Design a protein around this ligand. Structure first.
Ligand SMILES: [Mg+2]
Ligand SMILES: [Mg+2]
Ligand SMILES: [Mg+2]
Lengths: 354, 354
């Protein structure tokens, strides 16, 4: 495990993309930018308000980068929802991403969680205070069922962050620990259920397909995120408790074996996704198919994952996979690779100062 | 439905009880009775109040049956917690059992769930109205972390029963559906986290053990019920949607293969429980140990699972598994079979009229 498994990585990646039919969409670069700028503009103004500014403990530059990555993720994956929906989901997912910067023990602020909740008093933990206060803007876009899924997944997310403050990969032999923790901090049900705005879908008529998407998208989403993150986290000694690293510690297997597990689950997850929704309702298969492709595009385009480093390395190779990878990467860059100066302005800090 | 695989039911059950070495020595007969009555008495008085009598929509006979089934469960498996704790947990778990067999559409009363929650206004769904109002009586026994696990899991459970109203067992090929639904309706984190009252355990000193216990117990717990309750659910209309029968529909495999899959999972779950916690804090191991064996005694004795019927049929068969089954069924009866007339009195209905 000295060096990075570039060959293995390339094969698994090209396979993943072939399985999901990664291809070109009717989502034009011009539309991309209208959305990116719309979501960013509404969010930046939100996070620039004094209340948000004083209760949300985050370094200004990290908040700026966090918002930009999230807006990119939302706009590129929730392609079929409205501009307002992308904006509101962008705010919510930025809140969640930001919570990972807190090192503060939740205990003291969670001692009266239920009582304050039941009584209607503002939560003690400032994050819950801002988040529950803003939640209605996100929930108005969905039916009661989908809404409940968003509420629960976020609640799970809070506990996940809590557990992670312990930097615990699991007890050797605790095979059920890794995936339990990945579901906690994954936001699977939040993501999967937020793909169905009531304005475009009927929660009740499409109940079976919506529940199914949630169940399948949960695992596909987090595993693809783990896979595409495997490169940036490979030599990062700061990142110590990923799904893959916990598989090593908990299951007592080699990092390679852990990676093997992730690839098999991801590929299988991919096959079944298609095999199940291809014949189902077309509007649904469309939302699903666009999420998978955009999600992948976002990973390939965002610098956070540094996948450009892999492209640049295998750029001129005659191996089959290396080439397939580069074509895919170029496909992505074409619609995805966009300068931040084109939408992400002005910085949140400039708006907060005003 | 078709025909109960009595032959296999014995085969799987026997392997489990043999592997965990089923042996319940949690209480002396006098102790069991002492606890059963205390728990039943407080819950019975609670459920007989006019408000509870009015908002909880359940046929008196069913309420009484569920209560006795739950007091037994709590007392037989939470053998190390206090009497008060057992009583309050018995109330919470009776609220859930009632819903577990229920048939209703949550939709209309879940439209304003979040807004009413955040505002502190009483929920529209009567079940939530009662469960949330009584919850503090349950949470007062635990620290903030465990409390959060109880709240999330109860919330998950609600969604689970909702998804079940649709009688959907998964789209053939939707391999992630079965276990997704099971965790959703299993109350795994609720059960697992309620095993640690702050009066006996320090949530912060044993954060890693408790979290691990929650992750591992979730599956052991639910799978064991999936196997033990396979008989009472097999032909019940309300239980056709189950992990076993959903594995069949979703993974396109025979009932025979579904049961084999379930038992292998359970055996492995049992093996890791031992590997991980055997050499840990003895107080933790004791609680886990008492829960496991007591939980099995409960399934073997309680009316809800009608396992006496299986006994009264194979007690004659000279099969090896049928013999192994009856020995176990007898061993459990010697400790768990206890006449309701010794603790379950007076009936809730009689207290309601008073
Ligand atoms: Mg159920
Ligand atoms: Mg049930
Ligand atoms: Mg069951």
């Amino acid at each position: 495990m000295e060096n990075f498994p570039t060959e293995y990585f390339l094969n698994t990646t090209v396979r993943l993309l072939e399985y999901i039919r990664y291809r070109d969409s009717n989502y034009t670069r011009e539309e991309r930018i209208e959305n990116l700028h719309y979501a960013y503009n509404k969010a930046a103004h939100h996070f620039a308000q004094p209340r948000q500014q004083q209760l949300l403990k985050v370094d200004p530059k990290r908040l700026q980068a966090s918002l930009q990555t999230i807006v990119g993720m939302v706009v590129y994956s929730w392609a079929k929802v409205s501009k307002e929906c992308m904006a509101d989901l962008s705010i919510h997912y930025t809140y969640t991403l930001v919570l990972d910067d807190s090192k503060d023990d939740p205990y003291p602020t969670m001692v009266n969680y239920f009582d304050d909740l039941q009584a209607g008093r503002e939560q003690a933990h400032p994050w819950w205070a801002l988040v529950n206060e803003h939640f209605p803007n996100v929930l108005r876009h969905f039916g009661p069922f989908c809404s409940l899924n968003l509420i629960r997944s976020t609640l799970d997310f809070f506990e996940g962050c809590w557990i992670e403050q312990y930097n615990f990969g699991g007890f050797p032999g605790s095979h059920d620990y890794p995936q339990f923790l990945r579901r906690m901090n994954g936001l699977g049900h939040c993501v999967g259920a937020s793909l169905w705005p009531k304005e475009q879908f009927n929660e009740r008529s499409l109940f079976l397909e919506i529940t199914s998407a949630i169940a399948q998208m949960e695992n596909w989403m987090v595993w693809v995120n783990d896979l595409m993150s495997f490169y940036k986290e490979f030599d990062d000694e700061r990142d110590q408790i990923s799904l893959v690293k916990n598989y090593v510690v908990s299951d007592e297997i080699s990092l390679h074996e852990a990676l093997e597990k992730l690839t098999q689950d991801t590929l299988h997850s991919s096959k079944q996704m298609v095999a199940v929704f291809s014949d189902k309702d077309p509007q649904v298969m469309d939302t699903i198919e666009c999420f998978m492709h955009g999600f992948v595009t976002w990973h390939l385009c965002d610098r956070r994952y540094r996948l450009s480093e892999i492209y640049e390395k295998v750029k001129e190779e005659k191996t089959e996979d290396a080439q397939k990878f580069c074509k895919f990467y170029e496909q992505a860059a074409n619609v995805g690779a966009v300068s931040p100066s084109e939408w992400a302005y002005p910085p949140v800090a400039q708006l907060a100062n005003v």
